[PDB]
Nucleic acid binder design. Structure first.
Lengths: 154, 202, 202, 154, 202, 154, 154
DNA sequence: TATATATATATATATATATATATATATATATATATATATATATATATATATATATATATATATATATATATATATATATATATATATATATATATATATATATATATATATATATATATATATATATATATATATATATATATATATATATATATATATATATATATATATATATATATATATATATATATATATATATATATATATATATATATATATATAT
DNA sequence: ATATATATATATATATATATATATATATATATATATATATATATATATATATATATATATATATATATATATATATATATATATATATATATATATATATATATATATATATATATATATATATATATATATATATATATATATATATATATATATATATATATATATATATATATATATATATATATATATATATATATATATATATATATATATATATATATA
């Protein structure tokens, strides 16, 4: 799916698509007869509503992470691809460590994602003014690390 | 967290998934028979363009991508190969200078870019006759690829994307992998397909 | 930005897309069977006129358009070929002076227009008999096309566009590409059609 | 589709046609039963509404670009064809450069679209008075460039 | 401006357009089956009168109309031939003097009107037996057409338009174009019809 | 369609027929269900209204042209057929030349329509008094040209 | 099935899946005809509703057991795996002993589950601070035992 | 039949090319032999169709009666035959149901996590596609709209009279059917009312107290 | 302020119980009787309508004719032209969404495991019971038909005769004549196909060689189970 900024449209899309999936689920073969019944129809409607509500409520943290990643990237003039990559990184470090804390230390994941970003870690970027700039991957990674801990008030 | 590890690729069912989902959508536009013919034609076109060109290119280039910048962050390299296949070859819309400038601006080492252009040209000349004839019999290298490709793009003005879209393979027939010469090797893949239906009672 | 790069052309499904969409529209006017027959006849007419003339002409002239003014900015040339097929040939409504004046006013070099007129005549005479008979056996060129076409157009008054629409091919039958003589070359296209249905179990 | 100046008609057209697409989407096969239920009907209505609203809100910049290109062409007595072509050019340059800045210098796009317009760049035009005039493609391209930055106050 | 260039004629679908639209309109008056039978009978009558007479005349005379007064401004000729088939033949309501007076008053050269009247007579006598007998075996010409036609029309009183409407062909059967003698030439047209349904699985 | 002088009845006819076409458009197959819902019904009503309003707003110039052609013909005792033909001519010339100025000089269109009217251009007409009169096509053609330029104040 | 925290979504999921099972049950072969009749449809709907209501009313004790086990694990910093394991233990011990009292003394189940947990009963866990800690299985087992007895006030 | 390898022998397959024998195919024309198709007129051979009548043969249909063979039906009673219903208990058989537990199987559910499957979602570039939108013109096709006239088709309208089919209206009487209305009494079904007492059910109302529930009123802290 | 909690307490009324008792009304029985109805018979008679005939007229309308004309709109042409849309192609370019790639993550579900528990059902077994219906036996009557008999009589139908007579189609003659097919000639053509040559060149096969190599199965050995 092409990139689309989050909006109510996405909510409604998920809503209707889960409607289709659930009407498929219930009447495993007799989909038509279940489609004709208005009572089970209201049931499926409310189910899909609850499901969308769940999915929304458990997504705002990743939204905040992507937000701060966007702010940092804008402050460092980083191309969009790497902005998305750092969004994913922040999501990882909040989920596996900050929320549930699977058994792994931070700097370990840091070096993991570092080897992910190698080719090696100080990338040269040409701004719109033509002034080339360089940024260390490990630094900015560590930079958003603390910035994340600042958000959650860890 | 860490729900799963999804993998996205051509999984011998994108044909069926595409056809089925779009058929389901379009029945409420066309009716059964019309929507059926519609999805048939649509997928045939999507196949013979995108699969034949981009998927083969990606399958050929993936190992070298890993060798050079082995990472999940080969994403810019994929963007680069897409731009190369569309913007430069089959259209002559931009010269290699633009690509190398843009991607070093994005943080890519220049000689890597030149290397990738060399290989993608070396493969596209096999895939598409017209590009092979435009470039002729010259092996590309990060030492010479930029000069040759810039010569070619300067020679030809911006072409209508109608070339890059459909017409290119449409007007000219090619040797099948069901032939002699250089077309007697690949039926392996197709063979599996046949086998499948026989086992399915089809 | 730069969402995608769309391409507009006859994709061997414009038939079904046209049919299905207009069917869906007209069902709420006719009922099933009447709308069915209506869209059938509509597309058949649209085919035998627009495809048979304009699409063949566009396919023939595309390469030379690229040669002359290789660009996405060939749209005015498309205007010129359309008006030439309609306004000048098959209607005798305007002389070469009008087109040349108009398109040099639009910024087109004159001899380019003369060449394009020459080739569109040289091929339309093969497509349509009556035009070939009106022009006779005169090979058109940017040196002689203007005088010849001006003579032909002034010799005739303004013709009713009913000629340009349907009747022109309706009254006269022609050799099929399924015949002897010079009708023994094209069914390759139609050939694929047959194969298609046999594969679909049709 | 033929040329039509933008107006509310287009808004409503898009609205209704999106209704058709969405009712097609939800009931992947059971289009009829889903079409009969008024609740999912209201859902689809509101979804198409939000979708049209998104599409409108992210189109005004293109409208302004086409407007200024219209003004410039009218001032320079340029035939409609090239008016549309320059509208498309201004659209491209504001999109890839002014807003997102994919990594390419403006003059690069300038020369790209220059080759796009070749045949070679000083075209002769005959006004309604019969007075032939000539205009340089590259110059007016550079001209609307500056005007473009003037609008967004870049 | 100059949005499109419309063309108006019988396009092998006017049957379906007429039937379907009027069916849709009338179903709100009769209910399904009654409206169906109604549109069936309506179109059948419209066919056997208007098509068989006026459309054949128009297709026959279009060439001579172009040769004589080639123009998009040929309408006065069209209304001329319409009144001729209606007002003079099949009704004897007016003499040639009336039409010639009217159309020279409208600015038409008289001898042109005379030629057209001669030809419409020469063909209507082929289509309709009764008029062929009224005029007898007299080839019409702009030198003798007015005299003969005025003799005929003055000889007969004003006829009730019930003749010109339906009954004329209703009472008398004619040789079919599916017969021997002089009914062995045209079914080619109908032939296509047959093929059509076979292709539609009909 | 037979000749009918433009009036409000025509506006309403266009309105309702566009209603039919729109309800046909939205519910591509499920026309019935869409017909049952009053909401999409209100939407379609407003759409048809907007479309009729558009079509009206873009017709007054042609009305003026037909009017002045009628005045001229009445002044020169011309049968109705040629009055309609000259109405068409005036609308053509204002559209392609006066409004958008497609690339063609006036006299060119003049000679085009002249060849249109030939058979050659001085037609004789019999008035109601029996007095025959003659009029040159090209002259009155050029006449309404200037008359037209008077209207728009070109 | 993957772990999903209990919510109303689960309620509705179980509900609709029971609908499918019951419509399968009644019309052993003639599922279609039964699916067409709305009366048996209402009957099946109400049956599935009652069944979900049963399953809900007979699950809150296990929910409380899992809750208190979660609290204890949080107080002792245990990875999720063993948290679920002790949840299962608490469920077992409340079911077989506290409610129905199958013929077995508590310490018997205790040693049974102890042999279940061996490898041997004092596991070391490295907290997020890097401070390793150790906890005795038998102790915390006995600890949640009485804690369970406190909840039901046994 | 497997397990290791090696043969001959031949079954295919795929490698590269070459023959031969074919099966098609398209290339152009020419034959022959046919299968159709016309284009005009002649055959004999059905195939119906007529249009006239006459046969024999049989398909039905009547009209009257008589048989025979049946299909039902009713009248009265008698059998066997099996169906299924009740009245008594007993079996086997299996349908559920419940009572305690134990299985295996599976439907979900939750508890941790881990896979994979695809379902969507959010972050940047290529597809076919349609969603369109524009922005520029050109088409065909069409929906409409004019602008002049001409048709056929049917929608009403008016003009004059004539039909037919209905809708009412009236003018006399006669029906049947019915809605009521009386006029006598008698029923039945009710709707209430009264006169006696008794219920159950519920509407309140007391008389004592006790609940929950919530409606407001009386002491300080939060939203 | 209004309203919601966190304790204590009123009064007040909203209901609900917990007993006894009123009165009142909601129904219901229990008998007797009214009265007023709602119907229904039972006769007689109206009156008013709903129809229906029985004749003669109207007016009014619904259609249809029978001619002439409108105007109006439904379509269809006839030509020129618009305008608005339905699509389509031309080229360029956005945004939106719908599916597919190209990487990184989510969350959410559809599954599948990986262990531990539930709970709920689907079955199964392990004993003891039910009630229920499925049958079957062990003694008796209902409709109930399912047949059969055992007599009488219908009516109805299936046929068959026993006469006369239709009409209808099944064929067949008798004569004349169509039209439509079925094949056959009689000449001139086509088109299409079946083949056969006449050269060329493919493509796909069926084989046969010409070396190499697989896998596969047909056998045969060379040891072993």
């Amino acid at each position: 799916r092409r990139n689309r900024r989050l909006s109510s449209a996405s909510v409604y899309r998920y809503y209707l698509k889960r409607i289709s999936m659930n009407i498929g689920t219930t009447g495993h073969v007799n989909g038509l007869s279940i489609a004709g019944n208005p009572e089970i129809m209201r049931a499926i409607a409310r189910l899909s509503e609850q499901e969308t509500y769940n999915w929304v409520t458990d997504y705002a943290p990743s939204h905040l992470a992507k937000e701060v990643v966007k702010q940092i990237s804008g402050k460092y003039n980083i191309p969009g691809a790497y902005q998305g990559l750092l969004m994913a990184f922040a999501e990882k470090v909040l989920a596996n460590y900050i929320l549930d804390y699977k058994g792994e230390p931070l700097v370990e994941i840091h070096h993991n994602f570092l080897w992910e970003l190698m080719q090696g870690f100080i990338y040269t970027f040409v701004r719109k003014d033509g002034k080339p700039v360089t940024v260390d991957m490990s630094k900015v990674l560590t930079e958003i690390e603390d910035a994340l801990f600042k958000l959650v008030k860890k | 967290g860490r729900q799963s590890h999804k993998k996205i690729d051509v999984r011998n069912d994108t044909s069926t998934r595409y056809k089925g989902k779009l058929y389901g959508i379009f029945v409420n536009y066309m009716g059964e028979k019309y929507a059926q013919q519609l999805v048939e034609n649509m997928y045939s076109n999507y196949n013979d363009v995108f699969v034949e060109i981009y998927n083969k290119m990606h399958n050929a280039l993936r190992p070298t991508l890993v060798k050079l910048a082995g990472a999940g962050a080969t994403f810019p390299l994929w963007q680069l190969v897409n731009e190369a296949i569309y913007a430069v070859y089959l259209t002559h819309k931009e010269t290699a200078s633009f690509l190398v400038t843009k991607y070093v601006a994005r943080g890519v080492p220049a000689m890597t870019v030149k290397t990738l252009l060399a290989e993608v040209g070396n493969q596209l000349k096999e895939l598409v006759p017209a590009v092979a004839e435009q470039i002729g019999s010259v092996t590309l290298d990060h030492t010479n690829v930029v000069s040759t490709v810039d010569n070619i793009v300067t020679s030809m003005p911006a072409l209508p994307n109608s070339y890059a879209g459909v017409l290119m393979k449409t007007k000219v027939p090619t040797v099948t992998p069901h032939y002699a010469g250089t077309g007697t090797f690949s039926s392996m893949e197709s063979a599996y397909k046949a086998l499948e239906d026989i086992e399915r009672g089809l």
